[PDB]
Structures are given as structure tokens and as C-alpha cells.
Design a protein around this ligand. Structure first.
Ligand SMILES: CC(C)=CCC/C(C)=C/CC/C(C)=C/[C@H](O)P(=O)(O)O
Ligand SMILES: [Mg+2]
Ligand SMILES: [Mg+2]
Length: 523
């Protein structure tokens, strides 16, 4: 499919006038909200609720500290309140004990079925059940419990609750994309809340709409940068998904301070997409081998062994990193670009092996499979690329990333296992007997069902691992853990109808793209 979008995102003339109007009133709403947080005699359930709402609306990135000091204090000092308190502290790194859920369970470890009539309690427990780590076996039955009752109780709930419950049973807050969920909360829920806080709603719509202007600009910038390359008329075999790449970079981070980073990350994602397309639906055994080698060396002098068409990809790639080296200059962080590069070569290496395995009809043992198939997700790559733009990222931080941290390793597994479950049958048809599930089935001598079932558990384990990763002390500043977390969210979001949303956007991403980069939240 050619691009659903077309030249539509190419032009964007911001109404500075409008943007200024929005900015000014927002600053005034910022302070009003700030003072809401600083209120002295508030109850626990009112404070936890306040913070929950500000976060969901997507304006919590303004009061990053105010909210931290409040949770810290709440950490150093009913089901609904408990689970919420749990989730919020945990998402922030505070390792609060699960024995809070003790007083809600029987002597036999399970939850009292007498709670089945507490919807708000069941709901917040459901959301909290997704941020559990391996040491939280107390919450082993939290999800199936709250789910079954939520489903049963939802059809007769008043709105918007009913709509909030039905949506959560399809997508939990923790594992969803921030912008996407915020767009859902503001318009479909909080705006329709009878007790909604007018100041916070107003604040929430302006802000979301204002940052949408910036994203619209960014995407424009990237849409012109993508036409001046003409891989649309030059390299027809490749996928034109620059908008979808932007959604991915927007999923990694949306704050305005990451404007430089996002644009950097979009160019990479788009770029590497081409290379997979080359190795997959185009280049030949020899051509690919010549391409992988070319990449590994890295010096334009080689654009020669490469066929004419691979010459274009290769040059574009090298110039992109030269641009990167150039953008950074001002700060003096050009010496970190290499980090992204060594990862890219790693992706290219495996891409090659992947093909080699396809020609020989090799069906590796799962062990050997992942050792190679993990990087081909490009997740170490994007993770490493996401830092480039972050003005705070140091060498000592990339060094952390280069050792393949457990949080990153788990983010990558989630992207691998889910992708292999969602694209088994298709990839198979094409003769690729090297696909996850296959190696799994033959390796463990199990059915397709059992193989997928075992891959799911890998993902669950992975999540439990990512949740631990967020706990303090954090190996690096939380600021650099979130990009990894979000990447995993993006996987969970893109393959929900259990299907490639980036290779088949229409049913999954299109909507998000429309609600995030097209339609503004009507005030
Ligand atoms: C689902 C997610 C988050 C996708 C991230 C995007 C990425 C850089 C795409 C490049 C090309 C891909 C991925 C092809 C196949 O899908 P494959 O890799 O399966 O051969
Ligand atoms: Mg490939
Ligand atoms: Mg796949």
C-alpha cells in the first residue's frame, strides 16, 4: 500500500498568533494547577486522585517535581485507594510493598470475592495489576480477578465510567502509549465527567492541542526531508511509512524538549526501514553480502561495489549520520553518534544472517534464534538512537546502554516475541522457516499453540522485568529509562489485533495518527 496520507502532512503554517494565545493562558493554568498540588490539608485519596488525573490528562510533565515530592512523602509515611497508591508509587520507582493487598485477600492468598461489587476498586486494581514485578506473587491473581468482574459489571455502568472500564479492559494505562491514552482520557472521558475539574480540563485541551502544533511542524519538516530523498520514485520496493515512523518517535517521547530527539529518531527509523525492505523483498545473496560488508566498514569509498540502487541507500545513510554529527556540534555531543552506528551495523549484520538462514532453510534452536533475531527488531538501535537528541544524555549513559541492560533486553524481547506471534502465519507462507514460532515448535517439540503460548510468557516475564528496571536506585536517570519503556508500549499498541500495524497501518495506527496528528481536541 502506498501512503494512506500523501502530501497532507507536508505543509504546516503554525498560527503563531493562536499558539501565543494558548501558551499565555496555559502558563496561568499551570500555576493554578501547581497550587492545586501544593494544597496542605488534602486527604490521601484526594491527593492520589489528583495526581492520577493530572497524569492521565497528559499535563503531568509540567509538575514533574511537585508530584515526585508528594509521592516520596506518601512513600515514606480501601482497595481503590490502595491499588492507586501502589501503581503511582511503583510507576515512579518507589518500591512499595505488595503486602498492602494483603488486607484484601483471604488467609488462602486470593482476593475476597466480596470486593466484586466495588467497581472503582476493581478498576484501579486492574490497572495496578500490570505494573507488578516478580516479587509480587501476591498480585498473581489480581488481573484475572478484577478482569472477570469488570467485564460482568460494565454493561450497566453509568457513563463515562462504563466507557473508561471497557477501554481499560482492552488497553491498560501502564502498557499503552502516553499520547494515545491521554487523547482518549481528555475527550472520551474527563470531558464527559460530571465532576470534572474545569480548570484541569481547559488546561489539558489547550496543552494537548498546543503540542500537537509542534508535532505537526516536526512531521512536516520530516516529510520534506523525506521527499528530497525520493526513495519513493527511486527505490519502489521499500515501504513509505514516514508518518508511521513519526508516530513511533512520538510514542517514545512527546515533550517539546525532545523536539530535536524526535526528529532525529524519525529519520533513523524511516531509514533502517529501507534496509530491511532491501534484505527482504529485493537484494540478492551476493548483493546483500556486499551491502552488509559496506556498512561494517563505513566510508563512502565503497559506494562502488554496491549496485546502483544500493548506492543510494548507503549514501543516504552515511549523510544522515554526518547531519547528526553536525546538528549536535553546537553542544559538543558529536562524539556519541558512533553509539548509534555500531548498533546499526549490528542490525545489518543480523539482517544478513537472517537471509542466510532463509536460503539454507535453516531452522535454528530457539537459543540461537534469539541471539540473532533480537537485534533485527532494531530495538537496541532505536533505544540507542533515542538518546542522541536528549541534550542530557552523557557518554556514561550510552555506556550503560551498550552493555545491554536487563530493562532494554526485556524491551527487545517483548518486541520480538509479539512480532513473531502476530506475523508467524504470514512470514511462514513466504517460506521463512526461520521465524520465531517455527524454531520454537521444532525446538521444544510443541504445537503452534503451545509455542505462541510460551512466547507470551516470555513477554510477561519481560514486562515484570521492565517494571523492576524502573525501581530506584535506577542505573541511570529515569529520563533515560522511559524511552525504553515507551518502545515496549509501542509494540503492545501496534500489534493488538495481533497484526503488524507498521506493515498494515490502516486498522491500528491510522486512528492514532488521526487523533494525534490530524484532529485537534475540540474545546
Ligand atoms: C512494531 C514495531 C515497534 C516496529 C518498529 C519499526 C521498524 C524500524 C521497522 C523496520 C522494518 C520492519 C520492522 C520490518 C519487519 O516488521 P521484520 O522486522 O519483522 O522483518
Ligand atoms: Mg529482514
Ligand atoms: Mg516478524
Amino acid at each position: 500500500s502506498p501512503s494512506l496520507w500523501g502530501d497532507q502532512f507536508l505543509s504546516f503554517s503554525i498560527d503563531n498568533q493562536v499558539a501565543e494565545k494558548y501558551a499565555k493562558e496555559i502558563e496561568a493554568l499551570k500555576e493554578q494547577t501547581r497550587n492545586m498540588l501544593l494544597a496542605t490539608g488534602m486527604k490521601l485519596a484526594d491527593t492520589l486522585n489528583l495526581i492520577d488525573t493530572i497524569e492521565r490528562l497528559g499535563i503531568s510533565y509540567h509538575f514533574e517535581k511537585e508530584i515526585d515530592d508528594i509521592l516520596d512523602q506518601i512513600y515514606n509515611q480501601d482497595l481503590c485507594t490502595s491499588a492507586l497508591q501502589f501503581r503511582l508509587l511503583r510507576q515512579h520507582g518507589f518500591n512499595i510493598s505488595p503486602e498492602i493487598f494483603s488486607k484484601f485477600q483471604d488467609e488462602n492468598g486470593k482476593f475476597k470475592e466480596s470486593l466484586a461489587s466495588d467497581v472503582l476498586g476493581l478498576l484501579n486494581l486492574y490497572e495496578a495489576s500490570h505494573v507488578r514485578t516478580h516479587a509480587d506473587d501476591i498480585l498473581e491473581d489480581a488481573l484475572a480477578f478484577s478482569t472477570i468482574h469488570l467485564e460482568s459489571a460494565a454493561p450497566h455502568l453509568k457513563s463515562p465510567l462504563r466507557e473508561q472500564v471497557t477501554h481499560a479492559l482492552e488497553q491498560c494505562l501502564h502498557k499503552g502509549v502516553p499520547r494515545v491514552e491521554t487523547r482518549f482520557f481528555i475527550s472520551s472521558i474527563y470531558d464527559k465527567e460530571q465532576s470534572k475539574n474545569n480548570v484541569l480540563l481547559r488546561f489539558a485541551k489547550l496543552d494537548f492541542n498546543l503540542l500537537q502544533m509542534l508535532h505537526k511542524q516536526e512531521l512536516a519538516q520530516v516529510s520534506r526531508w523525506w521527499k528530497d530523498l525520493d526513495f519513493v520514485t527511486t527505490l519502489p520496493y521499500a515501504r513509505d511509512r514516514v508518518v508511521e515512523c513519526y508516530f513511533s518517535a512520538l510514542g517514545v517521547y512527546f515533550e517539546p524538549q525532545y523536539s530535536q530527539a524526535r526528529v532525529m529518531l524519525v529519520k533513523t527509523i524511516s531509514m533502517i526501514s529501507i534496509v530491511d525492505d532491501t534484505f527482504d523483498a529485493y537484494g540478492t545473496v551476493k548483493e546483500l553480502e556486499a551491502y552488509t560488508d559496506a556498512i561494517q566498514r563505513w566510508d563512502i569509498n565503497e559506494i562502488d561495489r554496491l549496485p546502483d540502487y544500493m548506492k543510494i541507500s548507503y549514501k543516504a545513510i552515511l549523510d544522515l549520520y554526518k547531519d547528526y554529527e553536525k546538528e549536535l556540534s553546537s553542544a559538543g555531543r558529536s562524539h556519541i553518534v558512533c553509539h548509534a552506528i555500531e548498533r546499526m551495523k549490528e542490525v545489518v549484520r543480523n539482517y544478513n544472517v537472517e537471509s542466510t538462514w532463509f536460503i539454507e532453510g535453516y531452522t535454528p534452536p530457539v537459543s540461537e534464534y534469539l541471539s540473532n533475531a533480537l537485534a533485527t527488531t532494531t530495538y537496541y538501535y532505536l533505544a540507542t538512537t533515542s538518546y542522541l537528541g536528549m541534550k542530557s544524555a552523557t557518554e556514561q549513559d550510552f555506556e550503560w546502554l551498550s552493555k545491554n541492560p536487563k530493562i532494554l533486553e526485556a524491551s527487545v524481547i517483548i518486541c520480538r516475541v509479539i512480532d513473531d506471534t502476530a506475523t508467524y502465519e504470514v512470514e511462514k507462507s513466504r517460506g521463512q522457516i526461520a521465524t520465531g514460532i517455527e524454531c520454537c515448535m521444532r525446538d521444544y517439540g510443541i504445537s503452534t499453540k503451545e509455542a505462541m503460548a510460551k512466547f507470551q510468557n516470555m513477554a510477561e516475564t519481560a514486562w515484570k522485568d521492565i517494571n523492576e528496571g524502573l525501581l530506584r536506585p535506577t542505573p541511570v536517570s529515569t529520563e533515560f529509562l522511559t524511552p525504553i519503556l515507551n518502545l515496549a508500549r509501542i509494540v503492545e499498541v501496534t500489534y493488538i489485533h495481533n497484526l503488524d500495524g507498521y506493515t498494515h497501518p490502516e486498522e491500528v495506527l491510522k486512528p492514532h495518527i488521526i487523533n494525534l496528528l490530524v484532529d485537534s481536541i475540540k474545546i
